[PDB]
Design a protein around this ligand. Structure first.
Ligand SMILES: [Mg+2]
Ligand SMILES: [Mg+2]
Ligand SMILES: [Zn+2]
Lengths: 44, 132, 159, 138, 176
RNA sequence: AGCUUGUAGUCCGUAAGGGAGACAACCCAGCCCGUGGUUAAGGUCCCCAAGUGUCGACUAAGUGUUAAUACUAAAGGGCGUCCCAAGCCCCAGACAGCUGGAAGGUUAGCUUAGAAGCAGCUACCCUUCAAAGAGUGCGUAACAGCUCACCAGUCGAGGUU
RNA sequence: GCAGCUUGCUACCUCGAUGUCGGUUCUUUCCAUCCUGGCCGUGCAGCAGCGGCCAAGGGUGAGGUUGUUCGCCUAUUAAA
């Protein structure tokens, strides 16, 4: 079930592309390894 | 599986030859392994009453001979005790060819079978005639 | 063989063709890249070396290929002029018994270098300077020595 | 008597060891459970855990758990305890957790060197915390 | 220009601030709050409706710490003056939920077919109120209300399925 | 390769005594016996003789606390922190936010119905006003608005490569 | 680049002797994790998969050929 708040606080985050750690949105640097490139958490 | 009221020693041993007591078409079988048994080092797998184990047909009709199948033990010569205090024993070991669930391929069983397999596997209970 | 097997300079040079025998060929096909007929690029940067070593020809070929791909993809086919400089004149030999008559036999070719000696050189316009730096940084990644980038001509333009 | 309230561990131990070796009456360290050990939390805990579980049962190193035992062991290393001089020195040291009844109200002094006020940052742990992390009821 | 490392806070009327020993104490119409803000190289003074905080060295660590302490002081005075609120919301597909306040905990019953109800702790005096599909969380301590909301959100997370298809629990529609 | 084979000097072999944790050949020193004195190498928190010495900075990792050395880890990266230089914008007002704007046309070329800024040619879609776009994304058959780029009012001191 | 768990290279110790390969019994150590515990991503609906991170407490068996280590095969097993 797709609801606004659930998607807001569940699948609205960026993912480090090396260690798979999830980060904030307005970021460009993994908080645990510092890798430059961050993708976005997969949608539907 | 579902627990039994009685306590059954594991008498028969992997390598034993049992006389199957149904009308499926086999006379003698060879216990290869016992379902749901881990074991420890140097210990041979062993089976008792109401234990599903894979066997091999040694004497019987040509089509059945050389076939790996499933079967359970219905009697054993090694004594075991009832819940309320008593020991029961038989003159000979026996086995019946069945499926994974418990439906026996034979529609007729010769001789008595222990009541505990009758409670664990109801189908063996119904297909039997005399229960002791 | 591994890269570090033939990378140090510990022994004399061994390059006279007429005395040794059976040197295998090379893979690097062209030593000039891009617009050769142009001579009006105001910026001329280059990749230099920080330490003496030996570079196999295969490493040079890989670096050239990667720099070519990057530069053509971003700057354009007519917007640069790359030129490799060092040619492999040395010869590499690999023993192949034990230590009995351990002298080796020719297996490849290598190009010795010297500290602060230019290897590559790229000329571009003013608008494609960052692409030139980006291209030259990947090429030095395949190279067996630490490498730094120096902007030789038009330093005031870019800086 | 010496009050170990807020003193560096090694500094205190070095001063006490030297002035035991010089030869005098015996010395008493009280409140030997809030002495300071400068350093980050995780590193201190890791090093003390490795020190604790290091021996063999018959003859291996038996590192103590109690806080005063740890302080005594720390002073024991700055001292020739195998010689006669060192053994005599070790016979005149008494470190107590809390305040023993007989030393109650006794006149105190401190080592002005080993002071936590003389530390740049707030990166330190107290000895009782390590004692309780090692599993000791004191 | 200058990299001066001083900060002012301009305390408002009502709050009786103090810096006895190290703990920083305030009191006002919305109860009282306490905190300790000791750190070497960073001195704080309270005087005339404002607390001045500064350092001595221009190292970036000192500057970060002075910013952090100024922010904490502002949040403390703001909390004691009026208070802080956090709003959340409930969502479910098939299994209705029984959010019930009992003691110092919030019990979540019947979460995704749940016989053992989950437990969420309440920190401090953070009074919470349940009303339909939303939860309001009052308080005077900012960290307290934040941590209470975080616990409530973290207890109700289903951790063996896909967020695309399962989305249930309590979510924060607006921070404190 | 603590491998093998050369060469100049000096050593061990055949070299005490002092210092390196112990150390054949590393540093000071080449040594008759006894007493006093001052130094070399090296050291001065305790073990251990003599500094919890002075001045100016750095490190937060127990990193390090290991002249040489057969005993000590590399390429690569770090908006970790401390410095130098060079450009660029700048209190008549730079950056991050608060804001809205992104209206003229268009629904771009598109056969599938439809990929109508986001499959596939093009070009700044306005003569014009800060803004106005062939245009990124939530949406998006196509779109559409929401609006990207891109400027404009707003704070009020340094910002940025 | 790491390890020294395969084979090489060297000849520093041992030829007035340091008793070889495999199996058996019994004890212990490492982690570079096969199962059991906890997490993250997915081209993860559920079941079951694929990839990675922490973790060495416990478990890791029975048989046919072969002297074999190694390896092939059989029926179980949470994994063998
Ligand atoms: Mg000599
Ligand atoms: Mg000597
Ligand atoms: Zn990462």
């Amino acid at each position: 079930a797709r609801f606004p708040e659930a998607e807001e606080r569940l699948l609205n985050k960026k993912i480090c592309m090396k260690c798979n750690a999830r980060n904030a949105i307005r970021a460009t640097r993994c908080r645990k390894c510092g890798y430059g490139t961050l993708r976005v958490k997969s949608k539907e | 599986m579902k627990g039994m009221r009685s306590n059954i020693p594991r008498a028969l041993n992997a390598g034993a030859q049992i006389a199957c007591v149904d009308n499926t078409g086999a006379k003698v079988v060879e216990i290869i392994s016992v379902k749901k048994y881990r074991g420890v080092k140097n210990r041979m797998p062993c089976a008792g009453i109401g234990d599903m184990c894979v066997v091999s047909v040694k004497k019987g009709t040509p089509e059945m001979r050389k076939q790996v199948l499933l079967a359970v033990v219905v009697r054993q010569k090694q004594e075991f005790r009832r819940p309320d205090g008593l020991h029961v024993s038989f003159e000979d070991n026996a086995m019946v060819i069945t499926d994974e669930e418990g439906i026996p391929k034979g529609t007729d069983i010769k001789g008595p079978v222990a009541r505990e397999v009758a409670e664990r596997f109801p189908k063996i209970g119904t297909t039997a005639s005399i229960i002791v | 063989k591994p890269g570090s097997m033939y990378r140090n300079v510990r022994q004399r040079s061994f390059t006279r063709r007429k005395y040794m025998g059976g040197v295998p060929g090379s893979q690097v096909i062209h030593y000039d890249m891009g617009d050769k007929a142009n001579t009006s690029f105001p910026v001329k940067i280059s990749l230099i070396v920080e330490e003496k070593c030996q570079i196999r020809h295969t490493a040079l070929e890989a670096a050239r290929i990667t720099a070519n791909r990057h530069l053509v993809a971003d700057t354009g086919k007519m917007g640069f002029y790359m030129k490799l400089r060092v040619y492999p004149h040395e010869v590499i030999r690999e023993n192949k018994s034990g230590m009995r008559r351990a002298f080796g036999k020719n297996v490849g070719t290598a190009a010795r270098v010297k500290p602060m000696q230019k290897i590559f050189t790229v000329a571009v316009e003013k608008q494609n300077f960052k692409a030139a730096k980006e291209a030259l940084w990947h090429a030095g990644q395949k190279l067996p020595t630490p490498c730094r980038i120096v902007v030789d001509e038009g330093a005031e333009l870019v800086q | 008597v010496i009050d170990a309230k807020g003193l560096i561990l090694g500094r205190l131990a070095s001063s006490v060891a030297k002035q035991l070796l010089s030869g005098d009456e015996k010395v008493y360290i009280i409140n030997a459970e809030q002495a300071i050990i400068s350093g980050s939390r995780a590193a201190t805990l890791r090093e003390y855990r490795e020190t604790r579980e290091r021996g063999a049962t018959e003859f291996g190193p038996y590192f103590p758990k109690r806080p005063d035992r740890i302080l005594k062991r720390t002073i024991r290393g700055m001292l020739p305890y195998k010689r006669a001089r060192g053994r005599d020195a070790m016979s005149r040291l008494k470190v107590y957790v809390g305040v023993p009844y007989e030393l109650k109200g006794a006149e105190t002094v401190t080592i002005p060197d080993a002071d936590m006020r003389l530390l740049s940052s707030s990166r330190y742990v107290e000895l009782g915390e390590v004692s309780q992390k090692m599993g000791s009821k004191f | 220009m200058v990299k001066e490392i001083a900060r002012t806070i301009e305390i408002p009327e009502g709050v009786s601030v103090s810096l006895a020993q190290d703990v920083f104490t305030a009191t006002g119409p919305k109860g009282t709050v306490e905190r300790k803000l000791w750190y070497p190289g960073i001195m704080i003074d309270v005087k005339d409706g404002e607390v001045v905080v500064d350092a001595e060295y221009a190292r970036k660590e000192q500057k970060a710490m002075v910013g952090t302490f100024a922010s904490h002081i502002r949040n403390l005075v703001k909390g004691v003056n009026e208070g802080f609120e956090c709003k959340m919301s409930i969502v479910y597909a098939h299994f209705p939920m029984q959010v019930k306040v009992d003691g110092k905990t919030l019990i979540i019953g019947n979460f995704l077919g749940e016989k053992k109800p989950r437990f969420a702790k309440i920190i401090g005096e953070t009074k919470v109120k349940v009303s339909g599909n939303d939860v309001t969380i009052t308080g005077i301590n900012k960290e307290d209300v934040g941590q209470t909301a975080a616990n409530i959100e973290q207890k109700t997370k289903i951790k063996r399925f896909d967020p695309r298809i399962f989305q249930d629990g309590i979510y924060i529609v607006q921070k404190a």
